[PDB]
Write a protein that binds this ligand. Structure first.
Ligand SMILES: O=C1C[C@@H]2OCC=C3CN4CC[C@]56c7ccccc7N1[C@H]5[C@H]2[C@H]3C[C@H]46
Ligand SMILES: O=C1C[C@@H]2OCC=C3CN4CC[C@]56c7ccccc7N1[C@H]5[C@H]2[C@H]3C[C@H]46
Ligand SMILES: O=C1C[C@@H]2OCC=C3CN4CC[C@]56c7ccccc7N1[C@H]5[C@H]2[C@H]3C[C@H]46
Ligand SMILES: O=C1C[C@@H]2OCC=C3CN4CC[C@]56c7ccccc7N1[C@H]5[C@H]2[C@H]3C[C@H]46
Ligand SMILES: O=C1C[C@@H]2OCC=C3CN4CC[C@]56c7ccccc7N1[C@H]5[C@H]2[C@H]3C[C@H]46
Ligand SMILES: O=C1C[C@@H]2OCC=C3CN4CC[C@]56c7ccccc7N1[C@H]5[C@H]2[C@H]3C[C@H]46
Lengths: 205, 205, 205, 205, 205
């Protein structure tokens, strides 16, 4: 429809793409996980596979508009390729992440963006003890691959992983699942890198 | 030939692409499933693999034309990349869906589109009981990834999955297969959501 | 060299792309299979894997030229991406077909095209009996995914599959292999649908 | 640097790409194999996997230049996608060939090109006897997919496969490995076809 | 923001891309490995799989700028596709390397670049003795595919692999891991090639 076509043209066809954040114009990315299932455990290679929805949110001044100028449109959906997205990645995957959903974002008129890719991830975890009452704990950090906390500030809205969509007939019972922001300085370099530590304790049903 | 070339140039090369539905101009997408086989059952990971044809229908005003101005052309085939297509996806897949057919659609002069991707899907299902007389029931929801019921309404022409192409020498006997529209709210979000729930009850033949 | 560059420019750069066949301007695609090996039999999932060359031939008026105008060039080779190709698809594959050869076609001055992709196909087949003297029969239909017989007709040059390149040390002996044009009529629709049925009867050697 | 940028611009931006060889202007491609390892043997499917470097060499008038006109530049490297490359392919692979290295060619001022991709190939071979003192022989032919001997002639610099890079701790001992030009006529076609027959005799070490 | 947009436009949009190093203008690439885990050992195929970060650094005059002309910007992140990158490859992989991180690099105003792809690599290694106290040693060389030491030289900052991020619950104990620059004259080629030899001695923990 007319007004939305006009809006997208104005936002995407008139200016160079947003080049990403810098120290002088940093960006906060909010990150949250919805765990769907632990789909595989391999005790011979120490690899565990998760399926989850990863919710990312950020806000750009360059994506703002006045709804009155565009037929009262307050938000729209658009391919994630049309916009800048943050390079948030798992620090200890063992295979390329697999994307399970369309790559499409929702942009709201205040310039906020929501992008929630469904993914299957293989990561490093020794599952020894998963077949016991105590279960086993695995952990994987997510964070920007090359932006420091001076450019991208990561945060969470809550430290509790969302389990309301966890598969009811999973081989595994989730004992706990938290997602915790950490600020780390690595030996080589003075700038902080932010991560969100996904920590899941589980056992066989 | 010349008339079809002209029609496609007018439909596709003269205006911005359709930007997708909105709350003001919502769209109805009709879904239908043709189940071909249950090709894998994994009781160690609770994953089941299906091969099916997914029929999708919708109608756009911007794809309409008068056959009289285009040599009586009443419909045409065109690459799916030339047109907007709905972001219908399975909500509980465990691996990227694999497409088995050419991505080509049929567009009719009244603006209606028919697109029928053949797919192999791995999804979450505990198959315990499949080797019994009672069998086992699996279920997977399909719906838009990013549009709520505000923008995309879904429906089925029938609640019965088409089994007329089900592989006659399958490992599995289909006891029942239904495709039902559901309306649902999620704790994550304020909008009504619409999905089509594919429910298949089956046993080893 | 110069004449061939000029010809390709005239054929591909100077006109809109051919929009494919229609009822008014139908096409005939000739199909022929060269079976190289039956490379896998899976009796747990009822899947069988074939490697073969699939020969496709058709003719377009828009690909004709007078050799006298182009230095006696009578044919040329070019990327299949440069030309329209028919959407011939296996109707019962269980995985995306894998292409084993370069996608390059031969175009002749009468407008005729020859394209012969080598492929690995997994398709639905219960191989029970393969280890017996009588062997087992598998079948898979190939046809246009989106076109009816009103736009694309199919034929074979011979109903006998070419076994002259069948792997001499294969695990399997081919007892018979045929490729037969078939017509399918559906209650819903006046237009006939065409396929070529590849039927292979085989046993362990 | 400046001189090289100018040369590449002159070679690749001012003329349409070379349209490949023809009967009038045929091309000789020289082929050589460097076998690194036999990395899998499957006696249940009769498939063997090789890892090797495949050296291809040819020469094009259109790639020539006077080094005196370009700052004494005598050769340069560029992405293989920048230039025409021959459609040399294994005739009996069972899976798409996997490329293990960058795809970059070396171009020399006399118009000669050298391109040496590292590859992993699965191909048809019954390995029965590999565990014996006699070993087993496998063979796979390589040649143009669409060009006859009238357009592309193949040759080797030597009949002996290069084993100087063969993995010192391979599971397999190479007893002989040859690469031999063959001219063949096929019933399918009236003109001669050229292949290089890679023949490897090996046993478990 | 505005200044970064201008910088990228000036660096990338205003001039031809860097055509890579030459004998007249050679380059030095610094390599460092951070070994995260030995994720698979296959004694039937002699293949071992590593997961590591590979840090690459180089410097280009054409990537320099004066921060005073660009709002004090001293560095920026950009897609690796925007810049030239060196063709550093493992010389003995058995499968295509899998990239685990976004392909993005950091460019600094002196023209230096830092690119750190995380990767999973399968490579040739007979792991016999891995299950002993002595352990086993594997090695894989990394170097330019097409540039000799006269065009691309390599160096490490240290000959010790960074083991600070090695998975604490790995199946394998690392006995030693070094990364050493080597110069090699291969019988195939008159100019020597430089590699960094990654040598890992390990055993089951
Ligand atoms: O020193 C490190 C190790 C640490 O490893 C976890 C993952 C990280 C994500 N990216 C990958 C490269 C890295 C980085 C950038 C600049 C200097 C050092 C450095 N790294 C990793 C680091 C974090 C942050 C960043
Ligand atoms: O937490 C959820 C689960 C629910 O799953 C079914 C599919 C949905 C379609 N889209 C996919 C992403 C989702 C959504 C957005 C923001 C936070 C959580 C979230 N999801 C899914 C949700 C619905 C609605 C929406
Ligand atoms: O009734 C069918 C089933 C059959 O399935 C195999 C594949 C086919 C390729 N396309 C997909 C849609 C289809 C078709 C068109 C019109 C009415 C029925 C109908 N189909 C499939 C059919 C063939 C032909 C065609
Ligand atoms: O236009 C179509 C194509 C599609 O093909 C897959 C199978 C289907 C199952 N049945 C077979 C006939 C069909 C149908 C009925 C009425 C008009 C069109 C039409 N078809 C197929 C269709 C689905 C649904 C239905
Ligand atoms: O019937 C054949 C088999 C033979 O197989 C080996 C490889 C060849 C290289 N290309 C691949 C396609 C082929 C060809 C073209 C047209 C009709 C049949 C046909 N083929 C192969 C043939 C040769 C020559 C040519
Ligand atoms: O024969 C070889 C083996 C050697 O292997 C290690 C890596 C090298 C880097 N590039 C990759 C291709 C190679 C080369 C070019 C032309 C003929 C043979 C050939 N190779 C490798 C060689 C070096 C140099 C060069």
């Amino acid at each position: 429809q007319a007004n939305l076509m006009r809006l997208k043209s104005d936002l995407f066809n008139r200016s160079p793409m947003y080049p990403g954040p810098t120290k002088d114009d940093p960006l906060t990315v909010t990150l949250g996980f919805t765990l769907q299932d632990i789909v595989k455990v391999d005790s011979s290679t120490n690899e565990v596979d998760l399926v989850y929805y990863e919710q990312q949110r950020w806000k750009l001044n360059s994506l703002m508009w006045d709804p009155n100028e565009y037929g009262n449109i307050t938000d729209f959906r658009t391919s994630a390729a049309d916009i800048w997205t943050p390079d948030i990645t798992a620090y200890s995957s063992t295979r390329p992440v697999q994307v399970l959903s369309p790559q499409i974002a929702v942009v709201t008129h205040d310039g906020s963006v929501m992008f929630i890719p469904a993914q299957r991830l293989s990561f490093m975890c020794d599952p020894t003890g998963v077949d016991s009452e105590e279960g086993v704990t695995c952990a994987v950090k997510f964070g920007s691959w090359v932006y420091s906390g001076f450019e991208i500030d990561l945060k969470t809205d809550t430290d509790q992983v969302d389990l309301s969509s966890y598969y009811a007939s999973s081989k595994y019972e989730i004992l706990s699942a938290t997602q915790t922001r950490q600020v780390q300085h690595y030996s080589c370099c003075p700038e902080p890198y932010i991560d969100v530590n996904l920590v899941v304790k589980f056992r066989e049903r």
